[PDB]
Amino acid sequence: GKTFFGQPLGLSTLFMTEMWERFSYYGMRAILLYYMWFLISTGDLHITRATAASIMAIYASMVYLSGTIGGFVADRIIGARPAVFWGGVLIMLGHIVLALPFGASALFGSIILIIIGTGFLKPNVSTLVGTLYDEHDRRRDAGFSIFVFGINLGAFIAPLIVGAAQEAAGYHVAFSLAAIGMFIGLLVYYFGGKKTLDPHYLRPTDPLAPEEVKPLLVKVSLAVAGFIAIIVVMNLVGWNSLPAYINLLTIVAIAIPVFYFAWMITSTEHLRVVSYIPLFIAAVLFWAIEEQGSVVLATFAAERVDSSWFPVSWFQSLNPLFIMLYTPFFAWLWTAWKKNQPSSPTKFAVGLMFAGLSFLLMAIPGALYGTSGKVSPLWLVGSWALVILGEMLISMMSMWFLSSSVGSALNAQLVTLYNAKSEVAYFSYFGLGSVVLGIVLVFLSKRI
Ligand SMILES: CCCCCCC/C=C\CCCCCC(=O)OC[C@H](CO)O[C@@H](O)[C@H](O)COC(=O)CCCCC/C=C\CCCCCCC
Ligand SMILES: CCCCCCC/C=C/CCCCCC(=O)OC[C@@H](O)CO
Ligand SMILES: CCCCCCC/C=C\CCCCCC(=O)OC[C@@H](O)CO
Ligand SMILES: CCCCCCC/C=C\CCCCCC(=O)OC[C@@H](O)CO
């Protein structure tokens, strides 16, 4: 019968839903840092470029953090299908905010809308893909990999199309193209979902029982009161700058996995959960390096690369390109070697080493040529080729949304250290430190 690459026809609707949301997201993130540079250069935005880079990292940290609870809200309160739809609306509104004739005054409102919108949509589109397959269906893994190919496809074309529109027609037009991309996703999702999506997921699948509503409200109200109380105290003692608020979000993002480790401590399982700790830190450190490609590598591309004949935002397409080119090779690898199946602690060790090698490579051109001129774009290509190879090995998602959030929160502190005089030392020591910790994991692989 008629399938979508051997999968139920409903996969195409969700395939295109996420390709276009990822289009809006990574198109925005390819030009947002340069947009803040522009607002700084005109005097509209009164922050340093280091603070602007810090914003990008903590921006990514909250998006991943908000995705840790979007599954709860859909499953228990609103439903998986309304969560994707109203999440997509909030994402679209966030990009429309940046297309309006405003300046720095619209940055926070657009960031808030997209943080919340992506939390509703991103975990619940992945959930709805599973609802196309029963527990029995072997096609579940193949359908998810086809779904991920649409993720990288949207992430690939977005910097090319959005970045070119920025250079040709300006920032406001480019940001409006991001909003249009999400709108395209909403059209296909709404009308397409109604034709092929189970109406069971228009409602929550585990709705709150009558006695569950009150303690959930108390839990939510206590967290909001405490967080607000901290901001109140911060203003009375004088810790009230933008970096101070960024530092607050950094601490909250890192304290969540630490507190969930500190008292989650049954010798049955107490040490087989201490198991997962040397690998959660390996994932945090890999994700930090990977997410600096949109920040530090975006800075290097605009400052240290002879790229005069094409938009510098296009470098952000190298990340999802290498994911697409590596994927069929590794699918072959994980089945061609039916009896190798290297252990997950070893893959995470070697994966972190490749990420460290990606930064070690970027220390060479500055050390060899100096930091005052410009070098070939192939240095950045080699860097992304090495860090994505580390991703192919590391291949509840909220926990994986979490290590992404903490690594990005760690970036909000480190990326302020990067500049022209910092370049070689920055790349050489965060790359070496990541490689040494990857070898330390080798010594402890199944010390577990
Ligand atoms: C069948 C797949 C095999 C692919 C693995 C090989 C990696 C692919 C390409 C490596 C190309 C080597 C670099 C070429 C070179 O040396 O540059 C020559 C060029 C002459 O015009 O000049 C320079 O001007 C440049 O300025 C000098 O600087 C460097 O070349 C430093 C290069 C950085 C080190 C890279 C060395 C080896 C990479 C091997 C990675 C293999 C990893 C596979 C898992
Ligand atoms: C998606 C971004 C990847 C871009 C990869 C580009 C690979 C180019 C390699 C050659 C180095 C730059 C050569 C400069 C050049 O030839 O410009 C032509 C001439 O006008 C000099 O400016
Ligand atoms: C307008 C200012 C607020 C912006 C909204 C940002 C909300 C972001 C994050 C709140 C979620 C924090 C709780 C996440 C959490 O603890 O889950 C982790 C747990 O699921 C691990 O699996
Ligand atoms: C209108 C307000 C903005 C939109 C509301 C959604 C804001 C995001 C989260 C609100 C908290 C809901 C409860 C989430 C929660 O308890 O997470 C627990 C965690 O274990 C999830 O697995």
Ligand SMILES: CCCCCCC/C=C\CCCCCC(=O)OC[C@@H](O)CO
């Ligand atoms: C700024 C835009 C305002 C909102 C415009 C869109 C609201 C118009 C009609 C409400 C549609 C709600 C549909 C919610 C939903 O679950 O859709 C899921 C989709 O699969 C269709 O069932």
Ligand SMILES: CCCCCCC/C=C\CCCCCC(=O)OC[C@@H](O)CO
């Ligand atoms: C329980 C709540 C957890 C913490 C969630 C709070 C996250 C809310 C907002 C994060 C936005 C990051 C900072 C945005 C920003 O600095 O842009 C505004 C700035 O350009 C104005 O000068």
Ligand SMILES: CCCCCCC/C=C\CCCCCC(=O)OC[C@@H](O)CO
């Ligand atoms: C389909 C509904 C949501 C999709 C977005 C619809 C609106 C998108 C674009 C409309 C025009 C964008 C405004 C462009 C703009 O004003 O900037 C250019 C100009 O101000 C600078 O010279």
Ligand SMILES: CCCCCCC/C=C\CCCCCC(=O)OC[C@@H](O)CO
């Ligand atoms: C200044 C630019 C306009 C700003 C407002 C843009 C809102 C325009 C249209 C809202 C699109 C709603 C989501 C698209 C969709 O497919 O919804 C279908 C559903 O509402 C039909 O019942």
Ligand SMILES: CCCCCCC/C=C\CCCCCC(=O)OC[C@@H](O)CO
């Ligand atoms: C930051 C502002 C957030 C405002 C909205 C957050 C609300 C969070 C928790 C309240 C959940 C109460 C929902 C009750 C509900 O819908 O179920 C009712 C029914 O199932 C009980 O019999």
Ligand SMILES: CCCCCCC/C=C\CCCCCC(=O)OC[C@@H](O)CO
């Ligand atoms: C539940 C216990 C509450 C105790 C307080 C919890 C939060 C403690 C400190 C939050 C500090 C916010 C970030 C630190 C900060 O403001 O640094 C200021 C500095 O960057 C210049 O203003």
Ligand SMILES: CCCCCCC/C=C\CCCCCC(=O)OC[C@@H](O)CO
């Ligand atoms: C999440 C629960 C509701 C919290 C209500 C209060 C939220 C206030 C701030 C959240 C963190 C965002 C901080 C970014 C910011 O406001 O920068 C302002 C900047 O001008 C500093 O002067």
Ligand SMILES: CCCCCCC/C=C\CCCCCC(=O)OC[C@@H](O)CO
């Ligand atoms: C008993 C609980 C375990 C032991 C407590 C461990 C500390 C818990 C949370 C602290 C989070 C780490 C601090 C965040 C951080 O490293 O950045 C600091 C920076 O943002 C301040 O400028």
Ligand SMILES: CCCCCCC/C=C\CCCCCC(=O)OC[C@@H](O)CO
């Ligand atoms: C298989 C890897 C190929 C070689 C990778 C090892 C590269 C080691 C160092 C990068 C080239 C160093 C350039 C020379 C240098 O940095 O010294 C500069 C300094 O002595 C001048 O004051």
Ligand SMILES: CCCCCCC/C=C\CCCCCC(=O)OC[C@@H](O)CO
């Ligand atoms: C070949 C694949 C892996 C790529 C990494 C191989 C290169 C390893 C390390 C290169 C870093 C060399 C650092 C040289 C250096 O810092 O010199 C200091 C001085 O020249 C600049 O301040």
Ligand SMILES: CCCCCCC/C=C\CCCCCC(=O)OC[C@@H](O)CO
């Ligand atoms: C798996 C792939 C590993 C990649 C290995 C790392 C190779 C990275 C950079 C090689 C730099 C060579 C650049 C020299 C070049 O061809 O252009 C000349 C330059 O002057 C033009 O601007």
Ligand SMILES: CCCCCCC/C=C\CCCCCC(=O)OC[C@@H](O)CO
């Ligand atoms: C097991 C949980 C994983 C935790 C990973 C994060 C490691 C904990 C704390 C990292 C603190 C980084 C502080 C960065 C720093 O101080 O330097 C940058 C600073 O100069 C920016 O002003």
Ligand SMILES: CCCCCCC/C=C\CCCCCC(=O)OC[C@@H](O)CO
């Ligand atoms: C010598 C340390 C043990 C070797 C472990 C192998 C690690 C992988 C590649 C070699 C990295 C060399 C980094 C060189 C370095 O850190 O120099 C820093 C430079 O800024 C000072 O000149």
Ligand SMILES: CCCCCCC/C=C\CCCCCC(=O)OC[C@@H](O)CO
């Ligand atoms: C065990 C978990 C590791 C996670 C955090 C790893 C890095 C922590 C702190 C780094 C901040 C110290 C800054 C060291 C430094 O000087 O680097 C900057 C230098 O490369 C350029 O000037």
Ligand SMILES: CCCCCCC/C=C\CCCCCC(=O)OC[C@@H](O)CO
């Ligand atoms: C300056 C030297 C640069 C190259 C050094 C990197 C290679 C040297 C040693 C790597 C292997 C060290 C021993 C690791 C090992 O096999 O531990 C046993 C472990 O596999 C069992 O879990």
